[PDB]
UniProtKB/Swiss-Prot annotation:
Cross-link (Glycyl lysine isopeptide (Lys-Gly) (interchain with G-Cter in SUMO2)): 60
Family in the record: Belongs to the BET family.
Post-translational modifications: Phosphorylation by CK2 disrupt the intramolecular binding between the bromo domain 2 and the NPS region and promotes binding between the NPS and the BID regions, leading to activate the protein and promote binding to acetylated histones. In absence of phosphorylation, BRD4 does not localize to p53/TP53 target gene promoters, phosphorylation promoting recruitment to p53/TP53 target promoters.
Free-text domain note: The NET domain mediates interaction with a number of chromatin proteins involved in transcription regulation (NSD3, JMJD6, CHD4, GLTSCR1 and ATAD5).
Site feature location: Acetylated histone binding: 101
Domain Bromo: 19-125
Secretion signal, residue range per the UniProt entry: none
Annotated knockout phenotype: Embryonic lethal. Embryos ndie shortly after implantation and are compromised in their ability to maintain an inner cell mass.
Subunit structure: Binds acetylated histone H4. Interacts with p53/TP53; the interaction is direct. Interacts (via CTD region) with CDK9 and CCNT1, acting as an associated component of P-TEFb complex. Interacts with RELA (when acetylated at 'Lys-310'). Interacts (via NET domain) with NSD3, CHD4, BICRA and ATAD5. The interaction with BICRA bridges BRD4 to the GBAF complex. Interacts (via NET domain) with JMJD6 (via JmjC and N-terminal domains); the interaction is stronger in presence of ssRNA and recruits JMJD6 on distal enhancers. Interacts with NSD3. Interacts with NIPBL.
Misc remark: JQ1, a thieno-triazolo-1,4-diazepine derivative, and I-BET, a benzodiazepine derivative, have been tested on tumors with success. Treatment with GSK1210151A (I-BET151, a I-BET derivative) has strong effets on mixed lineage leukemia and promotes myeloid differentiation and leukemia stem-cell depletion.
Annotated source species: Mus musculus
Protein name per UniProt: Bromodomain-containing protein 4
Parent sequence residues shown: 42 to 166 of 1400
Length: 127
């Protein structure tokens, strides 16, 4: 009975309604893809691997995981109906980090930076 990770969030759901919208195209080509290249992005590029990291309490505490790798796959697979759904997934990811960790932790400074950038990039979206 050693530690395991949960199954990752779904990136495809054939019974969920979806659309391609100008705002969602923008969220992939501009926002995600620019954030993905940032020097602080790496911890957020894949689901939190609590086994590899030796944080057996991670998924004890965080029940709604989200990461940019999943968000990337959702955008590529046209999983979302609108921009707001995806913005919500970005917000879940940031929030989870702030929940599990504490002010001034390196990982938090990273998420804080990314979140400021995020906000500056989604300030104006296409119509």
């Amino acid at each position: 009975m050693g530690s395991t990770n949960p199954p990752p969030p779904e990136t495809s759901n054939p019974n969920k309604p979806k659309r391609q919208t100008n705002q969602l195209q923008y969220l992939l080509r501009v926002v995600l893809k620019t954030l993905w290249k940032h020097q602080f992005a790496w911890p957020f590029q894949q689901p939190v691997d609590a086994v590899k990291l030796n944080l057996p309490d991670y998924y004890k505490i965080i029940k709604t995981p989200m990461d940019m790798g999943t968000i990337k796959k959702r955008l590529e697979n046209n999983y979302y109906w609108n921009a707001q759904e995806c913005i919500q997934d970005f917000n879940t990811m940031f929030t989870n980090c702030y929940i599990y960790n504490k002010p001034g932790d390196d990982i938090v400074l990273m998420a804080e930076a990314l979140e400021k950038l995020f906000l500056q990039k989604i300030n104006e979206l296409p119509t």
